[PDB]
Amino acid sequence: TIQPGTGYNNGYFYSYWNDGHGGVTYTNGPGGQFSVNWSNSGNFVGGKGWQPGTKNKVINFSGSYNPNGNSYLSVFGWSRNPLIEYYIVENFGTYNPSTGATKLGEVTSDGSVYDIYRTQRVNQPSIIGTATFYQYWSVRRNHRSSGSVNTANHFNAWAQQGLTLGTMDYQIVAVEGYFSSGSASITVS
């Protein structure tokens, strides 16, 4: 594993964060590749991509994703002004992160319909400190662990629905886990 933090590896931005509970290892491989192995973890997020992201990026990903419990595989990032955390969820484990959330529409992109949702985080950690902020979600109906994400289709559908994004901060393909186990090996481009 590598040390939690952010940086560059083989031309790609990477972010690896965990809550210190233990049970998760993250490694950066050649090119846009990263691996995650976890067993009875706490909360963590790790992956590769770009700093800053863009609003018209076509993100390609490929590999394997084998969660055992609560975990997501997503295009994941933030905007500033307004502060927004966003997800384009390609696959997940035992928990659909939109459970109980307000549905804001649908969008068809890259071979599947996605359902759109908005949630809110109240006084939670963020890229600027403790804050209350919205989260935007596109949740893919047809799960997969390889493919291409035309981010503009999502960002445009969100904007159409009144879900506005500010200036992009980082934008990665991320494996997130919440107190679960699993393995993943993903290559980004």
CATH number at residue 184: 2.60.120.180
| E strand intervals along 69-188 | 71-80, 84-92, 102-109, 112-124, 131-140, 147-150, 167-178, 181-188
Q: CA–CA separation, 16 vs 64, rounded Å?
A: 18
Q: How far apart are the first and last CA of the chain?
A: 22
Residue with tokens 């394997």: 64
Instruction: Give the number of domains in the chain.
Output: 1
Indicate which technique resolved this structure. Answer: X-ray
The parent domain of residue 51 ranges over: 1-189
Choose among 104, 107, 108: nearest CA to 117: 104
- Contact between residue 13 and residue 172 where contact means Cβ atoms under 8 Å apart: yes
Nearest to 126 by CA among 160, 98, 153, 166: 166
Contact 47, 41 (CB under 8 A): no
| Residue that is written with structure tokens 């992956």 in the block | 47
Catalytic residues, which ones? 85, 176
Q: What is the resolution of this structure in A?
A: 1.3
